[PDB]
A paper describes a structure:
The hallmarks of MbCO photolysis are the observation of an unbound CO accompanied by changes in the iron’s spin states and position. Upon CO photodissociation, sequential changes of the Fe spin state occur, ultimately yielding the high spin state, and resulting in a movement of the iron-out-of-(haem)-plane (FeOOP) as well as motions of surrounding protein moieties.
We performed a multitime point pump–probe TR-SFX experiment on MbCO at SwissFEL to follow the CO photodissociation process at high temporal and spatial resolution to obtain insight into the reaction mechanism. To check whether the dynamics of the system are affected by the pump laser fluence, we used four different pump laser fluences (2.4, approx. 5, 23 and 101 mJ cm−2, resulting in nominally approx. 0.3 to 12 absorbed photons/haem at the front of a crystal facing the pump laser beam, see Supplementary Table 2). Since the time resolution of our experiment does not allow the predicted 1 Å amplitude, approximately 42 fs period oscillations to be resolved, they would manifest themselves simply as disorder due to distribution of the electron density over a large volume, resulting in an apparently low occupancy. Recent quantum dynamics computations have linked the microscopic origins of ligand photolysis and spin crossover reactions in photoexcited MbCO to nuclear vibrations and predicted coherent oscillations of the Fe–CO bond distance. This prediction is consistent with our TR-SFX data showing an apparent increase of the CO* occupancy within 0.5 ps after low fluence photoexitation of MbCO, which mirrors the damping of the oscillation.
Numbering used by the authors: 1 to 152
């Protein structure tokens, strides 16, 4: 449950991401994969990436980063009214990709890390609070769908 002012902060922060969705998406995934190498194993199409240099050079990783952040941005712009947008992602990530909710926590924190890394001094405490709450809401609603599906 975010206030109007918190959603305003979220969407203000998101404008930073939308200016360079592929660069943000790439860095989010690289942060996820390098911080939590087990997550790489969930991607048949990225498990060949042995080094961060290879990850950085991967155009397909940037492409997927764009897909991920485009989806997330579409969800965030719903300001919590995202059941229709979230449902297929929860279902695909539980049933097809088999992504534990822990990895969604990892990527949520990776987003925060990337925002500070790319916008140092420009991702204020209020913005971090609002973005964190929005990612918690996202993760929590996914978690509810995971529970429905019995997925761990
Ligand atoms: C912000 C959180 C995430 C968003 C918005 C997101 C979004 C997406 C989207 C839109 C797709 C393609 C459509 C689909 O298959 O449903 C996808 C595919 C996929 N996602 Fe995610 N995802 C997120 C987090 C994760 C995490 C944390 C993992 C694993 C650690 C993961 C693993 C995968 C895999 C393996 C695929 C299939 C990739 C392929 O083979 O093309 N996702 N994701």
């Amino acid at each position: 449950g975010l206030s109007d002012g918190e959603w305003q902060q979220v969407l203000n922060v998101w404008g930073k991401v939308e200016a360079d969705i592929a660069g943000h998406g790439q860095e989010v995934l690289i942060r996820l994969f390098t911080g939590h190498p087990e997550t790489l194993e969930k991607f048949d199409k990225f498990k060949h990436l042995k080094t961060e240099a290879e990850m950085k050079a991967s155009e397909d990783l940037k492409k997927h980063g764009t897909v991920v952040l485009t989806a997330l941005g579409g969800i965030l712009k719903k300001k919590g009214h995202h059941e229709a947008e979230l449902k297929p992602l929860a279902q695909s990530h539980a049933t097809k990709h088999k992504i534990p909710i822990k990895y969604l926590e990892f990527i949520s924190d990776a987003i925060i890390h990337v925002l500070h890394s790319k916008h140092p001094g420009d991702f204020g405490a209020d913005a971090q609070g609002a973005m964190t709450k929005a990612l918690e809401l996202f993760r929590n609603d996914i978690a509810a769908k995971y529970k429905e599906l019995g997925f761990q």
